[PDB]
Amino acid sequence: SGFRKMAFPSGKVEGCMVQVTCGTTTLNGLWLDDVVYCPRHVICTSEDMLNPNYEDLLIRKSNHNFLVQAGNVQLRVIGHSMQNCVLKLKVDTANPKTPKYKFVRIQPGQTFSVLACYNGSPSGVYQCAMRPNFTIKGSFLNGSCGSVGFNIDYDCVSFCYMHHMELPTGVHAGTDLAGNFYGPFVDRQTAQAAGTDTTITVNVLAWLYAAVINGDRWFLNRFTTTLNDFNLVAMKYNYEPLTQDHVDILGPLSAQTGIAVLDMCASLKELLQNGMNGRTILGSALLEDEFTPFDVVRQCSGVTFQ
Amino acid sequence: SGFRKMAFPSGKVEGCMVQVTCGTTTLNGLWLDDVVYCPRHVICTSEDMLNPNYEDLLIRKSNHNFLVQAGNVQLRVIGHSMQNCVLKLKVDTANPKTPKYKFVRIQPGQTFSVLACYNGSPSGVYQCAMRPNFTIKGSFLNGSCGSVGFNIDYDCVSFCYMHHMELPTGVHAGTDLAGNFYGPFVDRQTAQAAGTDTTITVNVLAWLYAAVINGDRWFLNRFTTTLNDFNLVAMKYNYEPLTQDHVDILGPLSAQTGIAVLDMCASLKELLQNGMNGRTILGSALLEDEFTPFDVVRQCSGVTFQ
Ligand SMILES: *[C@H](O)[C@H](C[C@@H]1CCNC1=O)NC(=O)[C@H](CC(C)(C)C)NC(=O)c1cc2c(OC)cccc2[nH]1
Ligand SMILES: *[C@H](O)[C@H](C[C@@H]1CCNC1=O)NC(=O)[C@H](CC(C)(C)C)NC(=O)c1cc2c(OC)cccc2[nH]1
């Protein structure tokens, strides 16, 4: 038992991390087979960065301008091309550590592990959710761009995120690995705001089920509610609506605990209207929404990866 | 910016994880050079486990009784010996993936990363503190014993924890890698309780400094207090005493933020007497105590590891 914010083992991704230097800019790249993927703003300098034209900037570049640095071994760039907001640097060596992988784009509400990197070297690993407003609440400093987010499914690494920027509120924005931003953000230094967020209702319910699985039961009650009556309460508290598909996804957790989904909703409703009265749930004094139903089943059941 | 509970990249440890099977018991082992380390209770069966005599049980064992399983390659055991509560299985192959390492024992209040494993396969990674009562609030299921906790210092892995058991309150107990338990626990199925815990005061103050570094300032105040006057408040709230050495360790964070340590203590004092009044700090509605001063500097500065 116990419930922790758990990231995937990072080893498969650590073997893909390289350093990319162009001009005065150093950032991280992702080396899969004979390609290194990195944010296109590596080709920029501090005054290019107010409003760049990256197509113009890239035709001005040479292969030899890109210093790719894999640990203490330099990789020769033999070609380059831009795909949306990422660069693809073709190198003369395939990465012998390339895992099975996929480039997948995730949905707000879904979680992933981030391997924070500086100078091509991994710094730490942590779990993040894609917020409903397409930001992520990460931990990123100068030089962390090109760090990636990912899930692992048995032996296959599904890359879903490359880091590009921090918004003024201290949240983070980036692209999928095809270079397409999550949300209405651009890789320019202009006035960009996150947009109003909401709480991921289905995840809160998942975490309440994790709590019950772990012996926290004080918030349970005999009441119930309809899906429509719950959603009127969700609106008032800036929780996102709960759909019948969300109810379906929560079925397994409902069955393991014996608590109907709509009964748990009645418990959430009372937690929203009353607060927690000085008590905690799974060591938190807040309703946590960055655990998916999958994350709960995975942790509370013991799935591994090879 | 941002502040997350961050674990170390786990790759160096993943390459050391193996499966150890003896009789009906399967657990995890740690393969460094030509030795596999695992909990000694692998030699037990369900009725041995009420009150074992492990010396008696071990002399009854043969090398060939130990199936060591490194991925899909079997390791031949050529010797065995017990060191306190761990077994040392001598194998005929040195692990080619052995990192630089050390066996270190940590202090309550100190943090480490846990690579949770089942059947020799890594499941997830997360950050834990050693509580003042020598337990850890982890996430562990049947088969997770032999998972290890660790820190990484540049390229060197300091192993500090091997998992052995769960207490009735849902917290976890284990040994250092020399097989010596943290706290007053034994690897027997008898009535064992954790003992009353306290809050790690110096860590809370570190996390308040992380908050300030990240723009959370609402809890700051113009008041100050003496170390003795603060410690009278700490006692009443079951916070552990703050020493001058703790003040010294918090010096760098004090200097970066311009907030004297004792001024932050005055802020903690008011948070303890008043609560947070519906507000949050770094996304938490509780005072967090599982970040050391080092963890804060590491994250808020960007240290990596090779
Ligand atoms: C790449 O390593 C870096 C990562 C951020 C630095 C600090 N935290 C980060 O996550 N990305 C980066 O510096 C962006 C460069 C591009 C070209 C994408 C704009 N810049 C920003 O994130 C950025 C710039 C600004 C400005 O302008 C000064 C104002 C407010 C926020 C902001 N974010
Ligand atoms: C090893 O994989 C296992 C890990 C725990 C299983 C569930 N969560 C864990 O962290 N360790 C294990 O099963 C212990 C075996 C020894 C030989 C060390 C006792 N057993 C326990 O952790 C254990 C046994 C009990 C009992 O007795 C039934 C009562 C309360 C708590 C408890 N913990």
XYZ file of C-alpha atoms and ligand atoms in Angstrom:
678
model
C 0.000 0.000 0.000
C 0.813 3.728 -0.170
C 0.201 6.172 -3.017
C 2.908 8.360 -4.518
C 3.254 10.568 -7.547
C 5.256 8.007 -9.513
C 7.202 8.515 -12.723
C 8.248 5.831 -15.182
C 11.805 4.493 -14.952
C 13.801 6.924 -17.039
C 16.672 4.757 -18.284
C 15.352 4.183 -21.810
C 15.044 7.940 -22.335
C 18.376 8.816 -20.659
C 20.194 6.914 -23.401
C 18.613 9.198 -26.047
C 19.526 12.571 -24.509
C 22.183 14.655 -26.284
C 23.389 18.258 -26.245
C 22.743 20.539 -29.231
C 24.701 23.775 -29.576
C 24.234 26.325 -32.323
C 25.857 29.713 -31.974
C 25.334 30.893 -28.406
C 22.349 28.639 -27.632
C 22.691 25.257 -25.947
C 19.731 22.957 -25.390
C 18.792 19.280 -25.270
C 18.082 16.987 -28.173
C 16.476 13.575 -28.514
C 18.560 11.040 -30.475
C 16.524 8.208 -32.021
C 18.064 6.097 -34.795
C 20.076 8.573 -36.924
C 18.018 11.718 -36.139
C 18.324 14.238 -33.302
C 15.115 16.150 -32.483
C 15.336 19.521 -30.762
C 13.419 22.809 -30.470
C 13.863 24.961 -33.549
C 14.645 28.046 -31.451
C 18.193 26.692 -31.009
C 18.942 28.478 -34.309
C 18.026 31.835 -32.711
C 20.010 34.476 -30.871
C 18.672 36.873 -28.251
C 17.505 39.511 -30.788
C 16.283 37.005 -33.377
C 13.958 35.957 -30.581
C 11.566 38.916 -30.448
C 9.755 37.879 -33.649
C 11.768 35.312 -35.641
C 11.296 34.011 -39.146
C 12.605 30.489 -38.681
C 12.430 29.495 -42.344
C 14.650 32.466 -43.193
C 16.926 31.678 -40.260
C 17.265 27.995 -41.163
C 18.256 28.385 -44.831
C 21.127 30.564 -43.514
C 22.424 27.616 -41.473
C 25.020 24.971 -42.335
C 25.246 21.362 -41.125
C 28.569 22.189 -39.447
C 26.894 25.005 -37.495
C 25.161 22.330 -35.339
C 27.418 20.863 -32.647
C 25.717 17.643 -31.468
C 27.343 16.300 -28.362
C 26.431 12.846 -27.074
C 28.173 12.583 -23.752
C 31.854 12.938 -24.624
C 31.385 11.877 -28.271
C 30.594 14.384 -31.008
C 27.989 13.459 -33.634
C 28.491 14.694 -37.196
C 25.356 16.392 -38.572
C 24.803 15.392 -42.214
C 21.458 17.051 -42.835
C 18.839 19.228 -41.232
C 15.192 20.050 -41.749
C 12.418 21.757 -39.871
C 9.164 20.050 -38.901
C 6.839 22.683 -37.436
C 8.526 23.877 -34.204
C 11.162 21.107 -33.983
C 14.361 20.574 -35.938
C 15.411 17.192 -37.287
C 19.205 16.894 -37.440
C 20.275 13.886 -39.516
C 23.466 12.419 -38.013
C 25.899 9.864 -39.369
C 25.453 7.436 -36.446
C 22.300 5.625 -35.380
C 21.815 5.652 -31.620
C 22.632 2.087 -30.460
C 20.449 2.709 -27.393
C 17.289 3.559 -29.397
C 14.312 1.923 -27.658
C 11.169 0.885 -29.306
C 9.274 4.121 -29.511
C 6.252 6.039 -30.775
C 5.443 9.737 -31.177
C 1.980 10.206 -29.638
C 0.043 13.358 -28.802
C -1.799 13.264 -25.489
C -5.136 14.796 -24.333
C -5.526 17.281 -21.465
C -6.134 15.269 -18.321
C -3.555 12.619 -19.284
C -0.278 12.260 -17.397
C 3.341 11.659 -18.364
C 6.859 11.535 -16.971
C 9.318 14.363 -17.657
C 13.074 13.764 -17.718
C 14.479 17.214 -16.985
C 17.832 17.685 -18.705
C 20.558 20.311 -18.936
C 23.453 20.170 -21.419
C 22.265 16.758 -22.597
C 22.531 15.368 -19.032
C 19.464 14.152 -17.096
C 18.779 16.089 -13.894
C 15.592 14.568 -12.486
C 12.376 12.788 -13.298
C 8.823 13.677 -12.294
C 5.187 13.153 -13.213
C 3.066 15.899 -14.871
C -0.483 16.236 -16.179
C -1.469 18.089 -19.349
C -3.778 20.740 -17.919
C -7.132 21.474 -19.594
C -5.538 24.724 -20.802
C -2.655 22.827 -22.501
C 0.018 23.969 -20.046
C 1.925 21.752 -17.638
C 2.987 22.649 -14.116
C 6.617 21.572 -14.416
C 10.034 22.424 -13.045
C 12.245 23.909 -15.752
C 15.162 26.381 -15.794
C 17.215 28.002 -18.550
C 18.707 25.276 -20.751
C 15.981 22.708 -20.101
C 14.374 23.071 -23.555
C 14.364 19.834 -25.489
C 13.661 17.793 -22.361
C 10.899 15.365 -23.212
C 7.808 13.908 -21.609
C 6.843 10.289 -22.109
C 4.938 7.205 -21.045
C 6.217 3.650 -21.191
C 3.958 0.743 -22.263
C 5.751 -2.532 -21.540
C 8.972 -1.962 -23.514
C 7.826 0.900 -25.791
C 8.434 4.569 -25.034
C 5.615 6.864 -26.216
C 7.128 10.341 -26.433
C 4.428 12.969 -26.024
C 6.132 16.274 -25.074
C 9.165 18.422 -25.870
C 9.744 21.487 -23.674
C 9.980 24.957 -25.264
C 9.009 27.725 -22.899
C 7.743 29.146 -19.631
C 4.690 31.396 -19.455
C 4.551 34.468 -17.162
C 2.505 32.572 -14.558
C 5.322 30.056 -14.104
C 3.664 27.242 -16.049
C 5.220 25.529 -19.050
C 4.339 25.080 -22.720
C 5.744 22.778 -25.362
C 5.105 20.662 -28.425
C 4.470 17.071 -29.302
C 7.388 15.376 -31.015
C 6.055 16.388 -34.430
C 6.694 19.987 -33.367
C 3.049 21.046 -32.893
C 2.349 23.085 -29.766
C -0.046 22.015 -27.114
C -2.439 24.944 -26.831
C -2.422 28.420 -28.349
C 1.269 29.172 -27.845
C 4.115 30.088 -30.204
C 7.884 29.838 -29.812
C 8.315 33.619 -29.820
C 9.029 36.106 -27.048
C 5.641 37.841 -27.147
C 2.855 38.440 -24.625
C 1.376 34.971 -24.034
C -0.985 33.977 -21.240
C -2.110 30.488 -20.275
C -5.860 30.853 -20.336
C -8.213 29.891 -17.514
C -7.766 26.332 -16.188
C -10.259 23.831 -14.723
C -9.953 20.862 -12.379
C -9.813 17.412 -14.005
C -12.897 15.867 -12.386
C -12.415 12.267 -13.515
C -8.897 12.253 -12.055
C -10.041 13.574 -8.678
C -12.526 10.700 -8.539
C -9.752 8.246 -9.449
C -7.616 9.591 -6.598
C -10.551 9.289 -4.191
C -10.734 5.615 -5.185
C -6.986 5.299 -4.580
C -7.630 6.798 -1.148
C -10.314 4.210 -0.360
C -8.042 1.421 -1.619
C -5.450 2.734 0.843
C -7.759 2.996 3.873
C -8.786 6.675 3.766
C -12.595 6.414 4.067
C -13.695 9.411 6.155
C -15.137 11.334 3.180
C -17.487 8.516 2.178
C -21.205 8.951 2.684
C -24.532 7.186 2.250
C -25.883 9.841 -0.156
C -25.873 9.581 -3.934
C -26.541 11.963 -6.816
C -27.395 11.952 -10.499
C -24.771 12.688 -13.125
C -26.686 15.849 -14.062
C -26.983 17.009 -10.438
C -23.265 16.424 -9.909
C -22.337 18.384 -13.047
C -24.257 21.434 -11.815
C -22.003 21.362 -8.748
C -18.886 20.797 -10.886
C -19.627 23.911 -12.958
C -19.925 26.086 -9.847
C -16.534 24.910 -8.608
C -14.678 25.042 -12.007
C -14.363 21.317 -12.242
C -14.762 20.034 -15.716
C -17.954 18.141 -16.652
C -18.151 14.412 -15.990
C -19.284 12.295 -18.922
C -20.729 8.809 -19.100
C -17.430 7.728 -20.649
C -15.660 8.974 -17.486
C -18.142 6.920 -15.447
C -17.312 3.902 -17.605
C -13.542 4.381 -17.212
C -13.995 4.497 -13.438
C -15.858 1.166 -13.541
C -12.938 -1.066 -12.535
C -12.128 1.121 -9.529
C -15.819 1.185 -8.613
C -15.910 -2.610 -8.753
C -12.768 -3.164 -6.698
C -13.966 -0.878 -3.879
C -17.708 -1.541 -4.031
C -18.429 2.194 -4.270
C -20.644 3.214 -7.179
C -19.183 6.012 -9.296
C -22.173 8.237 -8.566
C -21.777 7.557 -4.840
C -18.195 8.813 -5.022
C -19.524 11.850 -6.902
C -21.824 12.542 -3.945
C -18.697 12.430 -1.744
C -16.856 14.864 -4.038
C -19.899 17.147 -4.005
C -19.791 17.317 -0.187
C -16.006 17.847 -0.224
C -16.493 20.765 -2.621
C -19.281 22.376 -0.583
C -17.765 21.733 2.854
C -14.017 21.485 2.362
C -12.002 18.918 4.285
C -12.424 20.346 7.817
C -8.728 20.065 8.668
C -8.397 16.442 7.508
C -6.244 14.995 4.729
C -6.636 12.467 1.922
C -3.557 10.450 0.907
C -1.398 13.029 2.669
C -2.958 15.949 0.784
C -5.101 18.796 2.099
C -6.279 19.499 -1.491
C -8.310 17.493 -3.977
C -5.613 16.102 -6.302
C -6.318 15.882 -10.036
C -3.045 14.714 -11.651
C -3.676 10.954 -11.303
C -5.607 9.248 -14.079
C -7.739 6.146 -13.500
C -4.939 4.232 -15.255
C -2.294 5.673 -12.902
C -4.326 4.504 -9.909
C -4.836 0.971 -11.224
C -1.169 0.793 -12.295
C 0.126 1.804 -8.870
C -2.445 0.080 -6.726
C -1.883 -3.239 -8.772
C 1.844 -3.275 -9.562
C 2.378 -3.138 -13.341
C 6.033 -3.151 -14.464
C 7.866 -2.531 -17.749
C 10.590 -4.324 -19.717
C 10.734 28.010 -12.371
C 8.298 25.522 -10.801
C 8.889 23.094 -7.936
C 8.183 19.376 -8.162
C 8.930 16.334 -6.075
C 11.787 15.182 -8.299
C 13.558 11.834 -8.295
C 16.994 11.092 -9.703
C 17.202 9.554 -13.179
C 16.871 5.851 -12.528
C 18.813 4.341 -15.434
C 21.988 3.497 -13.508
C 19.954 1.529 -10.963
C 17.667 -0.145 -13.541
C 20.692 -1.944 -14.975
C 21.376 -3.543 -11.556
C 17.893 -4.952 -10.878
C 17.465 -8.741 -11.026
C 14.902 -11.305 -9.894
C 15.708 -13.709 -7.045
C 13.563 -16.802 -6.540
C 13.990 -19.321 -3.758
C 11.279 -21.878 -3.169
C 7.934 -20.102 -3.400
C 9.260 -16.580 -2.744
C 10.184 -14.166 -5.521
C 11.699 -10.761 -4.831
C 14.155 -8.245 -6.260
C 17.912 -8.279 -5.985
C 20.631 -5.718 -6.604
C 23.455 -6.934 -8.875
C 26.747 -5.061 -8.412
C 29.971 -6.590 -9.748
C 29.640 -10.352 -9.069
C 27.283 -10.122 -6.046
C 23.484 -9.973 -5.870
C 22.073 -8.355 -2.705
C 18.554 -9.205 -1.581
C 16.449 -9.419 1.597
C 17.255 -12.527 3.597
C 13.564 -13.389 4.008
C 13.626 -14.794 0.453
C 14.794 -18.044 2.099
C 11.535 -18.211 4.103
C 8.157 -19.788 3.464
C 4.831 -18.620 4.867
C 5.144 -20.605 8.141
C 8.879 -20.020 8.562
C 7.823 -16.388 8.683
C 6.118 -16.217 12.082
C 9.426 -16.324 13.992
C 12.304 -17.494 11.766
C 15.822 -18.521 12.643
C 17.606 -17.362 9.512
C 20.997 -18.826 10.400
C 19.363 -22.244 10.744
C 17.387 -21.685 7.553
C 20.426 -20.584 5.542
C 22.749 -23.506 6.352
C 19.937 -25.731 4.983
C 20.178 -23.958 1.616
C 22.188 -24.832 -1.494
C 23.629 -22.498 -4.142
C 21.374 -24.141 -6.741
C 18.315 -23.338 -4.610
C 18.717 -19.647 -5.619
C 17.368 -18.874 -9.093
C 18.848 -15.485 -10.081
C 17.199 -14.125 -13.168
C 18.641 -11.075 -14.913
C 16.106 -10.207 -17.552
C 16.001 -13.294 -19.764
C 19.467 -14.522 -18.700
C 19.960 -16.802 -15.707
C 22.880 -16.118 -13.353
C 24.638 -19.080 -11.740
C 24.984 -18.647 -7.959
C 28.417 -19.847 -6.801
C 28.260 -18.830 -3.159
C 26.011 -17.287 -0.564
C 26.369 -15.595 2.791
C 24.247 -13.561 5.136
C 25.106 -10.026 6.230
C 22.620 -8.981 8.915
C 19.203 -8.854 7.175
C 20.487 -9.079 3.573
C 21.835 -12.021 1.606
C 24.907 -11.789 -0.600
C 24.682 -14.218 -3.525
C 28.044 -14.596 -5.272
C 27.444 -15.110 -9.010
C 29.785 -16.202 -11.770
C 29.275 -13.044 -13.870
C 30.118 -9.468 -12.943
C 27.382 -7.034 -13.925
C 28.748 -5.137 -16.967
C 26.375 -2.277 -16.105
C 27.746 -1.760 -12.559
C 27.952 1.994 -11.907
C 30.297 3.641 -9.571
C 28.591 3.157 -6.260
C 28.694 3.470 -2.478
C 26.677 1.930 0.360
C 25.717 4.842 2.637
C 23.301 5.016 5.555
C 21.167 8.148 5.671
C 19.775 10.231 8.594
C 16.073 10.872 9.256
C 15.150 14.055 7.432
C 17.239 13.136 4.368
C 15.615 12.232 1.055
C 16.217 9.608 -1.618
C 14.771 8.149 -4.797
C 13.076 4.737 -4.771
C 12.985 2.535 -7.871
C 9.980 0.308 -7.223
C 10.472 -3.102 -8.821
C 8.536 -6.331 -9.270
C 10.061 -9.568 -10.599
C 13.342 -7.754 -11.226
C 11.575 -5.218 -13.497
C 11.371 -1.501 -12.611
C 7.822 -0.204 -12.163
C 8.227 3.444 -11.171
C 10.450 5.983 -9.502
C 9.622 8.441 -6.729
C 11.159 10.569 -3.999
C 10.883 9.653 -0.274
C 12.132 11.075 3.019
C 13.402 9.004 5.943
C 10.927 10.009 8.639
C 12.159 10.896 12.144
C 10.696 7.547 13.239
C 12.795 5.637 10.642
C 9.849 4.703 8.422
C 9.252 5.920 4.885
C 5.903 6.770 3.334
C 6.322 4.753 0.143
C 4.265 2.862 -2.402
C 4.985 -0.863 -2.222
C 2.982 -4.034 -2.968
C 3.671 -7.750 -2.578
C 6.882 -8.617 -4.432
C 8.471 -5.180 -4.101
C 11.018 -6.262 -1.458
C 14.578 -5.737 -2.586
C 13.698 -2.487 -4.350
C 16.313 0.054 -3.371
C 16.516 3.717 -2.483
C 19.399 5.871 -3.637
C 20.903 9.261 -4.356
C 23.166 10.110 -7.264
C 26.186 12.435 -6.849
C 27.548 13.299 -10.293
C 28.183 9.782 -11.646
C 28.153 7.819 -8.354
C 25.097 6.021 -7.000
C 24.863 6.058 -3.185
C 22.528 3.210 -2.259
C 20.880 3.904 1.083
C 17.766 1.676 1.349
C 16.519 -1.836 0.605
C 12.798 -2.500 1.119
C 11.664 -5.284 3.483
C 8.231 -4.687 4.916
C 5.055 -2.713 5.479
C 3.877 -1.730 8.953
C 0.181 -1.871 9.968
C -0.216 1.891 9.470
C 0.703 1.552 5.794
C 4.225 2.942 6.131
C 7.354 1.075 5.091
C 10.493 -0.201 6.815
C 13.764 -1.473 5.422
C 17.513 -1.733 5.804
C 20.610 -0.024 4.557
C 22.582 -2.065 2.054
C 24.636 -3.628 4.847
C 21.395 -5.238 6.027
C 20.862 -3.105 9.158
C 17.304 -1.890 9.702
C 16.378 1.717 9.914
C 14.583 1.989 13.243
C 13.424 -0.614 15.748
C 12.037 -3.127 13.256
C 12.782 -6.788 12.517
C 12.125 -8.916 9.441
C 9.588 -11.087 11.265
C 5.800 -11.226 11.145
C 5.212 -9.922 14.673
C 3.342 -6.963 16.167
C 5.390 -3.929 15.085
C 4.305 -0.301 15.263
C 6.039 2.722 13.773
C 6.372 4.968 16.781
C 5.244 8.590 16.961
C 6.535 10.821 14.136
C 7.443 14.533 14.039
C 7.612 17.139 11.284
C 11.062 17.846 9.814
C 11.311 21.557 10.641
C 14.444 22.395 8.653
C 12.875 20.920 5.510
C 9.667 22.925 5.887
C 11.800 26.067 6.051
C 13.695 24.953 2.935
C 10.398 24.495 1.085
C 9.227 27.935 2.221
C 12.401 29.323 0.634
C 11.632 27.363 -2.541
C 8.196 28.982 -2.453
C 9.689 32.480 -2.215
C 12.133 31.665 -5.022
C 9.082 30.704 -7.089
C 6.989 33.805 -6.322
C 4.798 32.585 -3.440
C 5.282 35.386 -0.874
C 1.923 35.797 0.885
C 3.068 34.101 4.116
C 5.991 36.480 4.623
C 5.854 38.991 7.442
C 7.803 41.810 9.065
C 8.033 40.011 12.438
C 11.002 37.995 13.647
C 11.668 35.614 16.530
C 14.524 34.095 18.486
C 15.618 30.519 17.906
C 14.507 29.670 21.453
C 11.101 31.339 21.022
C 10.570 29.489 17.745
C 11.477 26.127 19.300
C 8.832 26.565 22.005
C 6.290 26.857 19.187
C 7.806 23.882 17.329
C 7.401 21.644 20.389
C 3.710 22.517 20.719
C 3.086 21.578 17.093
C 5.257 18.369 17.019
C 7.833 19.885 14.761
C 11.305 18.819 15.584
C 13.691 21.329 17.215
C 15.676 23.691 15.010
C 19.398 23.830 15.709
C 22.023 26.414 14.871
C 23.416 23.910 12.373
C 20.005 23.918 10.626
C 20.192 27.726 10.565
C 23.655 27.463 9.020
C 22.519 24.972 6.356
C 19.710 27.348 5.395
C 22.236 30.173 4.927
C 22.544 29.938 1.136
C 18.767 30.018 0.690
C 18.565 32.928 3.130
C 21.174 34.800 1.100
C 19.572 34.177 -2.284
C 16.152 35.420 -1.119
C 17.226 38.121 1.334
C 15.053 36.599 4.068
C 16.851 35.897 7.337
C 16.377 32.345 8.603
C 14.796 33.613 11.815
C 12.425 35.801 9.791
C 11.231 32.721 7.915
C 10.817 31.015 11.297
C 8.496 33.855 12.327
C 6.498 33.104 9.151
C 6.341 29.384 9.994
C 5.246 30.262 13.529
C 2.290 32.269 12.167
C 1.436 29.498 9.676
C 1.366 27.007 12.554
C -0.810 29.188 14.798
C -3.148 30.460 12.070
C -3.148 27.844 9.330
C -3.172 28.889 5.689
C -6.667 30.455 5.536
C -7.634 28.650 2.330
C -4.442 29.582 0.452
C -1.736 27.315 -0.960
C 2.059 27.243 -1.087
C 3.701 25.651 -4.145
C 0.398 23.947 -4.920
C 0.098 22.449 -1.431
C -2.444 23.181 1.295
C -0.080 21.572 3.861
C 3.366 22.497 5.128
C 5.623 20.103 3.180
C 8.633 18.561 4.925
C 10.136 16.079 2.422
C 12.436 18.565 0.634
C 15.884 19.110 2.101
C 17.792 22.384 1.716
C 19.956 20.506 -0.810
C 16.893 19.383 -2.803
C 15.728 22.995 -3.039
C 19.094 24.346 -4.188
C 19.489 21.420 -6.619
C 16.105 22.006 -8.242
C 16.009 25.767 -8.086
C 19.626 25.893 -9.644
C 19.710 23.017 -12.141
C 22.345 20.458 -11.096
C 22.671 17.429 -13.407
C 24.440 14.056 -13.228
C 26.693 12.047 -15.552
C 14.542 26.803 -23.230
O 15.540 26.153 -22.415
C 13.775 27.823 -22.385
C 13.097 27.148 -21.180
C 12.525 28.188 -20.204
C 13.611 29.037 -19.552
C 13.121 29.303 -18.124
N 12.137 28.263 -17.886
C 11.813 27.614 -19.006
O 11.033 26.687 -19.070
N 12.813 28.496 -23.260
C 12.869 29.812 -23.411
O 13.700 30.496 -22.839
C 11.883 30.487 -24.318
C 12.545 30.792 -25.662
C 11.530 30.987 -26.804
C 12.273 31.196 -28.116
C 10.667 29.752 -26.957
C 10.622 32.190 -26.583
N 11.506 31.732 -23.690
C 10.610 31.730 -22.704
O 10.222 30.693 -22.192
C 10.038 33.001 -22.200
C 10.370 34.301 -22.586
C 9.495 35.093 -21.768
C 9.316 36.466 -21.686
O 10.103 37.269 -22.449
C 11.280 37.710 -21.767
C 8.402 37.031 -20.795
C 7.621 36.205 -19.993
C 7.787 34.831 -20.081
C 8.720 34.296 -20.961
N 9.075 33.036 -21.255
C 8.302 -8.048 0.413
O 7.985 -7.917 -0.989
C 7.115 -7.574 1.254
C 6.761 -6.110 0.940
C 5.435 -5.701 1.600
C 4.242 -6.467 1.041
C 3.078 -5.469 1.040
N 3.723 -4.170 1.093
C 5.025 -4.268 1.371
O 5.791 -3.330 1.446
N 7.457 -7.773 2.664
C 6.697 -8.551 3.422
O 5.707 -9.114 2.988
C 7.065 -8.753 4.862
C 7.768 -10.101 5.030
C 8.628 -10.179 6.304
C 9.359 -11.514 6.345
C 9.674 -9.083 6.299
C 7.802 -10.057 7.578
N 5.835 -8.772 5.620
C 5.232 -7.623 5.927
O 5.588 -6.562 5.443
C 4.104 -7.595 6.889
C 3.490 -8.680 7.518
C 2.487 -8.037 8.320
C 1.551 -8.557 9.201
O 1.478 -9.906 9.348
C 0.517 -10.512 8.479
C 0.648 -7.734 9.876
C 0.706 -6.356 9.697
C 1.650 -5.830 8.828
C 2.522 -6.674 8.152
N 3.517 -6.446 7.281
